[PDB]
Amino acid sequence: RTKENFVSKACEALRRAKYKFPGRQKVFVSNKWGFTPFSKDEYQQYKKKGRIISDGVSCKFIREKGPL
Amino acid sequence: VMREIKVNKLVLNICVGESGDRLTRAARVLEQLTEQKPIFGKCRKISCFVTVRGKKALEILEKGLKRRKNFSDTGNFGFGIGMDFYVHLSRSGYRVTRRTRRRSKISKTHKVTKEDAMKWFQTK
Amino acid sequence: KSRGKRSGTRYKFSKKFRKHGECTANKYLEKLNYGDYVDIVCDSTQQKGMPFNYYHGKTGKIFHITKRGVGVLVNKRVKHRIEQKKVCVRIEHVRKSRCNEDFLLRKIKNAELIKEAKLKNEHINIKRKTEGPKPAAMIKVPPSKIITIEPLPFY
Amino acid sequence: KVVKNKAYFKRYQVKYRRRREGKTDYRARKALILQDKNKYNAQKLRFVVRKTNSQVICQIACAHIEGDKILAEAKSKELIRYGIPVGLKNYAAAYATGLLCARRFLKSLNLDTQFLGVEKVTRKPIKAFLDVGITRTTTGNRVFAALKGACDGGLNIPHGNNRFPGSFNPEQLRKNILGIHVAEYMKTLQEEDNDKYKTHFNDYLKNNIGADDIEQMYLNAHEKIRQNPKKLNAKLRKKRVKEKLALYVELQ
RNA sequence: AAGAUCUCUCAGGAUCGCUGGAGUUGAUUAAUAUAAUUUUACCAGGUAGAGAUAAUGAUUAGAGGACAGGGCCUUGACCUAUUCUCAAACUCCCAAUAGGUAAAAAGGGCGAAAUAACUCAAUUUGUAUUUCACUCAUAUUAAAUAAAAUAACUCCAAGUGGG
RNA sequence: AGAACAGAAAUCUCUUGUAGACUAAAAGGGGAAAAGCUUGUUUGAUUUCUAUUUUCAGAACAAGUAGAAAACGUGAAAGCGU
RNA sequence: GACUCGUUCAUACUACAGUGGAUACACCAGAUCCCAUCAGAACUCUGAAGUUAAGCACUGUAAGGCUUGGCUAGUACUGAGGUGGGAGACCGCUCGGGAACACCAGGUGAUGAGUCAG
Incomplete structure (x- = not known):
């Protein structure tokens, strides 16, 4: 987990890691298809409308429920 | 209104409210001086006490007795102006809590809290 | 082998979820006795006249009843033969079976159909349906109510 | 921990x-219900006695x-119809209430004689039963007086003597059902x-009933009971929540 | 047949199973008994599965909080919302498959009368039984399908018990 | 959260407390106006006999279940106790 | 309107609030007698002075839980078949059956018998 600027480096590191894992493995680059709302379009939209509040590392979605 | 505090179950003696071990020692010296002494309590060495009803007992005990809010929601006032002695608190509608037929319990609204007890202490 | 009585405790004898001490009034009172079929089900509450493991969920006829005991004729396969065994169980364990209730409702409904037919002097069959093969039918379909399907690309 | 939480609620049963x-x-x-399966159809009558703070209630x-x-x-507030205006929890009142309920039940059944198979010289003769009714079964407890009244009434119930004074004193029991102990x-x-x-005893004074009068009033009531x-x-709730949100924006 | 049970028992024996003979029963009426089956009712389950924010045992991280360790701060524990991975010897929930009971004439209906030493105030209160009735589909059928009696049942004995 | 003694060798009080206790041992089941804990009164841990269930050849023994004929025990109130 | 006996045993639970007390419930008042405890706290007994302050009745709350439905998903999973594929691990296919959590939406009781007052 890092910047997209270093995504190739991260992918390469996992490719280095694969030689020390038994049999076939696949590095998967996309975090848009990684969910946990880690889509860029989701990050901007959720942040903009204050939907998602960070409790560290990952970010928690409000759901219109209980007292304030 | 009818919500105010009431009281049962306290015990007394004829000395100065010495507390603890010392009260028992003083009582033994007093027992050696003169053979008269009051009655047994209920507990798990030994000493003797006067059984008196409720409110009247508390009034004598308070006069004997003589962080500002040393008090706690228990109804325990400690010693002020330790021992195995009785002390107690009850709210007005308390009976529902132990009463058999329709059970239930005292409400959060009805309960004493710290503050009402603190008003009661200031009142006397 | 090495087989004591209640073996398989964590399996069969384990209680139903939140079901503790269930002993309400209606449980007792059913009364069809000597002709009746009856299911043998374990109760979490009652240990006193609990059956052996095999008889759980099985059904059989009542042949004898006492104060709160029931004798039940249950079928058991013993190797090369199925044989009838006299299972003593308690009132809490016996549950009224529902197979009789299906026969009875069908008898009553058919009897009403027979009675109706008899009043008219009709010739008709009160026998159960087979759920036979579907006959011809019709629907009128505009272009809006019909949807084109196709397989899906990976996504 | 908080202890009282979603898990605790999910696990919970109040029955x-x-x-x-x-x-x-x-x-x-x-146990009151239970009977032999070959003694089916037959009913174990319970003589229900429940102790209110205002009055005792007796049902079959x-x-x-x-x-x-x-x-x-x-x-007990039926006793008004028999002229009794006060003392609605009383031992005599409980006796009379049981006695009336038994006598009315026999009248409803027909025939004042309880049993066919009685002995020739000195339902069934005694087949109806206690309802324990939550109140604690001490000596002088209310249920036993009501049951004793029902027995003397006509219905009859199995009994010991263990909850009357002297556990027995029949004269003291007689005084209690008369109303002498109150007097x-x-x-x-x-x-x-x-x-x-x-x-x-403020009501007794208003009624103009002295201690003296109680034994007679119960005795007269018994004959009258015997004779007689x-x-x-959600849409509204949703609207309220929206309005409250706006109100909070205005309020702060 | 190389299963089982008991055996100073594991190269055996006995008794069950599975085999043959012999007899009887009833079958011939395309049906009833009957069926390694499905139908429609009706059940029994806690394995596959799934879960950790349901409990148990685990178990990786930070975030938000009001006491403890270190030098007003930091580090912790502790709480709270969270968070990562878990068990077939854990279970909120939870299959398919496999398994059980059911489908009326020696019986069932609704009635009367009988019988009792049971029951119940209640020798017709119920019960059960019995005798009389009235009557339930069935020309084919009380859901299918069936070289379904080649079925039953009794006897006597064999081989087998290492797979 | 309070009380000089158990905070920290087996204590005292109030409040919160679905069982996280306890149920001789042995592990799992079951069990909260109780099968836990306390107390009272007790001896049925009885005599006789079945139908049976477990293991099973559907023999034994052993362990059970449901009753019955007795005499009692307890509550006395239903009941429950082999 | 209230109560008693109940039934189903959370739609019936819990939490925090508010509204209601003709008759009723309860809180409340007392201990001679019946009774019971160190203790009239509870329990028993006898009252009926006050009061809705609680219990109780009813509602409310971006309440929690429970509770139905959708949706998760024909996914996961799975019986029989195959001289099907795959080096192996495993994966398709034919005939069939088929979840769960999460999530979303709704809901927060119904009812037999008897009584009493209006």
């Missing part, structure tokens, strides 16, 4: 509604598959203090 109230223990209920109940069927009823306390209290007497047969929908 029977009456058990939540503090009525109907089920342990008694099953038989338990059935859609709930209990009530055959007979007497409550003795009234006269004694009046003797000690007139204001405490007046403030205590909002919620709000």
Whole structure:
């Protein structure tokens, strides 16, 4: 987990890691298809409308429920 | 209104409210001086006490007795102006809590809290 | 082998979820006795006249009843033969079976159909349906109510 | 930990509604109900006695598959119709209430004689039963006096003598069902203090009934008894929540 | 047949199973008994599965909080919302498959009368039984399908018990 | 959260407390107006006999279940106790 | 309107609030007698002075839980078949059956018998 600027480096590191894992493995680059709302379009939209509040590392979605 | 505090179950003696071990020692010296002494309590060495009803007992005990809010929601006032002695608190509608037929319990609204007890202490 | 009585405790004898001490009034009172079929089900509450493991969920006829005991004729396969065994169980364990209730409702409904037919002097069959093969039918379909399907690309 | 939480709530069971109230223990209920399966159809009548702070309530109940069927009823404020205007929890009142409920039940059945098979010289003769009814079965407890009244009435119930004074004293029991024990306390209290007497037995004074009069009034009553047969929908709630949100924006 | 049970028992024996003979029963009426089956009712389950924010045992991280360790701060524990991975010897929930009971004439209906030493105030209160009735589909059928009696049942004995 | 003694060798009080206790041992089941804990009164841990269930050849023994004929025990109130 | 006996045993639970007390419930008042405890706290007994302050009745709350439905998903999973594929691990296919959590939406009781007052 890092910047997209270093995504190739991260992918390469996992490719280095694969030689020390038994049999076939696949590095998967996309975090848009990684969910946990880690889509860029989701990050901007959720942040903009204050939907998602960070409790560290990952970010928690409000759901219109209980007292304030 | 009818919500105010009431009281049962306290015990007394004829000395100065010495507390603890010392009260028992003083009582033994007093027992050696003169053979008269009051009655047994209920507990798990030994000493003797006067059984008196409720409110009247508390009034004598308070006069004997003589962080500002040393008090706690228990109804325990400690010693002020330790021992195995009785002390107690009850709210007005308390009976529902132990009463058999329709059970239930005292409400959060009805309960004493710290503050009402603190008003009661200031009142006397 | 090495087989004591209640073996398989964590399996069969384990209680139903939140079901503790269930002993309400209606449980007792059913009364069809000597002709009746009856299911043998374990109760979490009652240990006193609990059956052996095999008889759980099985059904059989009542042949004898006492104060709160029931004798039940249950079928058991013993190797090369199925044989009838006299299972003593308690009132809490016996549950009224529902197979009789299906026969009875069908008898009553058919009897009403027979009675109706008899009043008219009709010739008709009160026998159960087979759920036979579907006959011809019709629907009128505009272009809006019909949807084109196709397989899906990976996504 | 908080302890009281979603997991604790999910696990929880409170069981029977009456058990939540503090009525109907089920342990008694099953035993009262229970009978031999070959003695089917026959009913074990319970003589139901429940102790209110205002009055004692006496019913004849038989338990059935859609709930209990009530055959007979007497409550102490029926005693007004028999001229008794005060002392509604009293030992004599409980006796009379049971006696009336039994006598009315026999009248409803027909035939004042309880049993066919009686001995020739000195339902069934005694087949109806106690309802324990939550109150504690000590000596002088209310249920036994009501049952004794019902027995003397006509219905009859199995009994010991273990909950009458002298556990027995039949004369003292006789005084208690007459009302003498109240009368003795009234006269004694009046003797000690007139204001405490007046403030205590205030209704008796208004009625103009002295201690003396109680035994006669119960005796006359016995003969007379013997003779005589909002919620709000979701759409509104949603609207309220929106309005409250706006209100909070204005308020702060 | 190389299963089982008991055996100073594991190269055996006995008794069950599975085999043959012999007899009887009833079958011939395309049906009833009957069926390694499905139908429609009706059940029994806690394995596959799934879960950790349901409990148990685990178990990786930070975030938000009001006492403890270190030098007003930091580090912790502790609480709270969270968070990562878990068990077939854990279970909120939870299959398919496999398994059980059911489908009326020696019986069932609704009635009367009988019988009792049971029951119940209640020798017709119920019960059960019995005798009389009235009557339930069935020309084919009380859901299918069936070289379904080649079925039953009794006897006597064999081989087998290492797979 | 309070009380000089158990905070920290087996204590005292109030409040919160679905069982996280306890149920001789042995592990799992079951069990909260109780099968836990306290107390009272007790000896049925009885005599006789079945139908049976477990293991099973559907023999034994052993362990059970449901009753019955007795005499009692307890509550005395239903009941429950082999 | 209230109560008693109940039934189903959370739609019936819990939490925090508010509204209601003709008759009723309860809180409340007392201890001679019946009774019971160190203790009239509870329990028993006898009262009926006050009061809705609680219990109790009813509702409310971007309440928690429970509770139905959708949706998760024909996914996961799975019986029989295959001289099907795959080096192996495993994966398709034919005939069939088929979840769960999460999530979303709704809901927060119904009812037998008897009584009493209006």
